[PDB]
Design a protein around this ligand. Structure first.
Ligand SMILES: [K+]
Ligand SMILES: [K+]
Ligand SMILES: [K+]
Ligand SMILES: [K+]
Ligand SMILES: [K+]
Ligand SMILES: [K+]
Ligand SMILES: [Mg+2]
Ligand SMILES: [Mg+2]
Ligand SMILES: [Mg+2]
Ligand SMILES: [Mg+2]
Ligand SMILES: [Mg+2]
Ligand SMILES: [Mg+2]
Lengths: 251, 252, 252, 252, 251, 251
């Protein structure tokens, strides 16, 4: 019933949207497109809890799995989102095994984790048998965005209770001393990205990546990424508007 | 210290404006910073209420376009509250008669020209001490022409001194004339009606605006001499962009 | 891809609906998931404004009931904005005359049947490409009967083709007829008036709905042949539940 | 269990009220705790919408002043929704004729005295079981006098039984009479008009209120026998205070 | 003037409501019933700071003491709630003495704690003499919800500056390997609950518990609990609606 | 382009407003007065992220630099505010060198700090060359509010990446065992304030202070403070209303 986990169990990757603009209308509209999930970015956006909550509902209604890229790897924040019906969590700046364990701790009820019990919205979706299936209903990915996370990749990938990792390639490029360019060709960054993917797959884990274009996303899917996001709502909208203006003004 | 759309017109040039149906300030500012002279916030065919429009007006102004609003109804008190919150252009629906156009005009001007109530919370901050002496010029007012009746009454509507002109809604006009509600309709009867409105507006010395769903249609409308052209709704542009990103991502 | 209330009616069955005066999405979804065919959001006798109703409509739809709204006033532009936000049933207050019923009908249907403005942001997402061809059937419209005058004019109100029928508000009817504003009033004159409205509605081939404050009163109204029965307000049910929990907790 | 303004009047004393154009509950409560009998929330010349006014009413009540609202328009349904949200005084704009005053009165009283719709969500909590039997007395209603026409029609407006009296807006009156829209205007023709309204109100046994922009002007209006005096807007007081703090901070 | 502390000082327990639904109208309505306090749940609900703030006002107006069960035992979050007029704090997942000390630190101004000074709403309620009485105006309870908290109960109860503990019995049952059933009869959970109560009372501290029914709440009051909550708004409303539907449909 | 840094570079202090009331209208109105910056207080106020976000826009439009005094010295909170267009950060309760380093870490992109990249609003203000100038576009001040911070002042002032310190004199007075009086004359508090200023200036750093009146602010400017705030909106408004009432009532 988690649409991303269904993709994976059926041998296919998932393609997901990425929202930095608050509100329910575009969230539902994009969810109804051929995205398997839609990620709401609570880090690099003005989207707070009050605004994310109805967006989760709208995405679920539209027929994509609602995901959140959180502001921080904080257990209580993550738990509140889970209980509000976030069914995927992408936690930024997971740099060590212990930080990955902190992420895992939030995603599972005791004995596997320490998630606090009060599943307001998942109990409506899944019913009274939710507890037994709860861990499978949520996808959890630790972000790999720093030199330190790269160095600790195998120790992060060893953590039970996380599905895998999600590469933040602009932050990773910046931490490597390069420009935080979307969809970069910088050879060292491209190499590090491929390394993380290879390590994740060798560990039997999933790997995702953030993309700024459909063409780059196609390549990432071909390279074997399990979870590919493309492209941020604001960037797509701004580019579309610039083109409309150029067309109208005959430029 | 000038309405950017009126400045376009004073230079003999049209204005090009954006069109928002998505609430929020971030895309509003981002689009205002583009080569749009104005950005219209649609409070009719959207979920944008007053609470959400208010910060959007601020964001558009900061971004450097003139904040406009297409209201849900031609109601004087709603329009006045928007003016005092820093809407500097008003596009009012269902202006089908001279009297309805007079009702629009009444809201846009202080006495004796109109009956606008006094308390210009935000325009006084933008324009400072010089505001009241130029208040009417700081606002653009356009009556929507979107029905058979408005088309029949176009000359009487255009005779109303206190409106800058009219704003055509082609899809609703098409639907009210018995045709499909197409985006950027080119239904022959609708095309003729639109051409008639443009001709009558310029005969009357008034401005004529038109809603567009694409850059290409906007280009034609600008070439046809329209004074105010909107293109294209944020939601439509975003949905089409996402559909294309998906198609490219999933391509062989 | 169907209005759940109209489906009930097409099967010769009544619809039972919830009634919300508390803003927020969580109880809206929870109650929609119960054996309610619709959930009405009361925008009149509540603090629920447009900003708060919008996400509630989404939550009710997700929960699997038809989202309805009892508006604060029979105003076409307010009603249209709700339709485009995904309200699929409208209950409009103070429909006291045929002309007021025509005003309600005008908002619910695209031309030529009505004058509904085009921009179906959310219904187009729910219904997809097939929307416009079935748009009128996707919405239920009920005129409230809550005054002496509406009672006198019931046949003229029911003659309006573009409304599904009427919705009785017994407490306001009682108050306007000179009686106490009781929840689930059984004041003899009010009982007779309500029976008259039901008979006239069915004589006219129209639907008749009624607001209820309890499950027991709703059961009787269903047995009397009402087509749409609401029971009972979230706030009233919650307050009564809490009072009983307290009494049980503090008992000897 | 009493309207604090009506209690002032029953003691033969005027009421002094605050005036808020800034949304939010914290200053609303803080100002209500001062020696104001009421605090008026301005929903016209402010960005305060229903969503934001609702918690402010609660905060003012907690602070110990009577919550009042100056509405954006004299619309019965808007007024009723505010009453049911715990507005206990209504100041309605643009009451220019007897019929408009009757429209205000209609919203403030249950049948048979008016047509107020029944569902007193918050007044029932404040007043308890005794509410309905005293409902009309719990609310104060004032028709705004802010135009030449209202001035001409003052006696007919004051003849309407279901309003407590009138509320003068001097700046708008000045502007509509052809003068500058000054805060606390003392333009001779305006001064005479205001004196006339006060005299006619007391001749009719009605209450007369007036908006003030300063404590000094309010003091004079109280001395002239006004029954309800507001002073001064939160925004204006705050901006002037900040300007003076800056001047003191930057002084030699 | 804190209505719960008045109950206690007068030899009686307090009975409190429990809100998971945001908004002011039911909050005031329930506060006007015979509840001494109303707890707003910011953990297992969609209630964020923006929505809790007016609810505190509404509860105070209705004549109950406004309490908050916070999302997390975080000092700065708690301080902001205190300054917004939360007059009771129930902090989840207090598992160690040090965590209880962190809770206490937020509830008292220096020298007793480190609460930052800027009491926007308490200064309106209490006036300029607020500082001298501030500690008494707030009730603070550490939640006992885990095996670890049970094990550390005496060390938690030793912390000056907290009034006592509040049992979270569904989380406690789950952490003990049982079902997170409301008002459970499971013998080990029932025993652990009684143990915490006994230890708290022996330490001269207060003990509260969360309940899902009036009948269970009656028993808890009889057993000597000082602070008893019953029952969550959403659960009461859902149950009421199900009964109305069954009655209407003749089922 | 940061108006405060321009003041400093031009040899003048900055005078700033201080908002505890949410909303955009007074924020813009005060920004248009002769304030160089306006600080939004997210600690001792009901202002959450959802309400601060439009206020930043309004202050920038009005022509003052938007600053925020955060609820807590938390890196991810600070980063989200920076990306929403907060161009000054005042972080409360910075008591140790390590806490000051945590503040600095949030204010600078790698390699100087660890700020995560996604500058939604600064990229609109500054354009694609933002990264190279990003550190200069933001002013960062650590608050000195406790005996511990006083004791550690030189170690705090040694931290690269913070501009200096901001004295919270009411909390400081309280932590010293005195009354939390605004603009206090208490000799020990006055001495400690002067000490912090002197140490900051000797270290080549900036020093700010919170004031409750224009007269005290004038003295602070004369004493050499680089960043002086005066006075809180709510306090100014309440005092103004009391005076209007006294005038009206002839008292
Ligand atoms: K989909
Ligand atoms: K522009
Ligand atoms: K259902
Ligand atoms: K008072
Ligand atoms: K009570
Ligand atoms: K300035
Ligand atoms: Mg990143
Ligand atoms: Mg006026
Ligand atoms: Mg239209
Ligand atoms: Mg009614
Ligand atoms: Mg728990
Ligand atoms: Mg401090």
């Amino acid at each position: 019933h988690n649409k991303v986990r269904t993709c994976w169990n059926e041998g296919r990757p998932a393609l997901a949207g990425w929202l930095q603009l608050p509100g329910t209308l575009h969230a539902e509209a994009l969810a109804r497109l051929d995205y398997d999930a839609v990620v709401i970015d609570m880090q690099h956006s003005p989207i707070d809890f009050g605004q994310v909550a109805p967006m989760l509902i709208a995405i679920e209604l539209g027929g994509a799995e609602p995901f959140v890229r959180t502001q921080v790897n904080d257990p209580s924040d993550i738990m509140k989102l889970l209980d509000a019906g976030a069914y995927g969590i992408i936690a930024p700046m997971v740099n060590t095994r212990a930080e990955a364990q902190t992420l895992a701790s939030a995603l599972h009820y005791s004995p596997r984790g320490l998630r606090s019990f009060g599943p307001r919205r998942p109990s409506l979706r899944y019913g009274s048998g939710y507890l037994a299936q709860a861990s499978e209903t949520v996808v959890g990915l630790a972000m790999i965005e720093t030199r330190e996370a790269l160095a600790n990749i195998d120790e992060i990938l060893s953590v039970d209770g996380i599905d895998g990792v999600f590469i933040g390639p602009t932050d990773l490029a910046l931490d490597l001393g390069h420009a935080p360019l979307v969809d970069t060709e910088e050879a060292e960054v491209v190499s590090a990205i491929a390394h993380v993917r290879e390590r994740a797959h060798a560990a039997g884990k999933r790997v995702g990546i953030w993309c700024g274009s459909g063409g780059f996303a196609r390549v990432k899917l071909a390279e074997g990424f399990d979870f590919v996001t493309a492209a941020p709502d604001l960037a797509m909208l701004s580019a579309a508007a610039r083109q409309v203006i150029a067309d109208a003004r005959a430029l």
